[PDB]
């Protein structure tokens, strides 16, 4: 049972690290999409120009 | 002059015991002896845990 608890602790640390890495990738995508959508004018503006 | 046990006898949990302790909060001592005597059709264990 002690071995089970040690391996469970190492696995929960692994899960946390992997979830955080994926969250950082998603956050990068989110931020880039956000700025890209910020600087984009709408269709009527660009077709008029 | 009397012959006495030199040291304590050690009780250990088996992997089956670990499974039943994690899932059911219960341990049946010497699980495998029971299971073998149960599937072989033998009504009596030879010894106690």
């Amino acid at each position: 049972l002690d071995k089970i608890l040690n391996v469970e602790a190492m696995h929960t640390v692994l899960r946390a690290l992997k979830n955080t890495a994926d969250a950082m990738e998603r956050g990068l995508i989110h931020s880039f999409l956000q700025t890209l959508l910020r600087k984009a004018p709408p269709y009527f503006v660009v077709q008029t120009l | 002059t009397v012959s006495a046990p030199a040291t304590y006898g050690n009780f250990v949990l088996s992997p089956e015991n670990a499974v039943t302790a994690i899932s059911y909060h219960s341990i049946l001592a010497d699980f495998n002896s029971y299971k073998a005597h149960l599937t072989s059709g033998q009504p009596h264990l030879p010894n106690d845990s």
Side-chain angles (χ1 to χ4, degrees):
Chain A
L1 295 179
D2 174 61
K3 280 169 160 58
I4 285 163
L5 295 163
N6 296 158
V7 79
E8 215 294 312
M10 75 166 79
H11 287 315
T12 180
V13 180
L14 264 46
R15 292 191 303 261
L17 290 175
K18 204 173 296 189
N19 200 359
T20 298
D22 203 51
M24 293 304 292
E25 291 289 280
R26 293 168 187 270
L28 176 53
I29 286 171
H30 184 71
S31 189
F32 182 54
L33 182 59
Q34 190 156 310
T35 189
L36 206 67
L37 187 64
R38 186 185 300 127
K39 66 197 182 82
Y43 170 88
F44 52 90
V45 170
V46 293
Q47 188 60 30
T48 288
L49 293 177
Chain B
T1 183
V2 173
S3 63
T7 185
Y8 305 100
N10 183 217
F11 184 95
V12 188
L13 261 53
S14 78
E16 307 81 17
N17 272 356
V19 178
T20 69
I22 298 314
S23 70
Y24 305 128
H25 312 269
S26 195
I27 287 284
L28 180 60
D30 295 327
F31 185 100
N32 281 317
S33 192
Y34 282 84
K35 107 185 178 194
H37 279 263
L38 190 65
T39 60
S40 60
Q42 290 186 249
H44 294 101
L45 296 180
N47 210 1
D48 189 37
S49 81

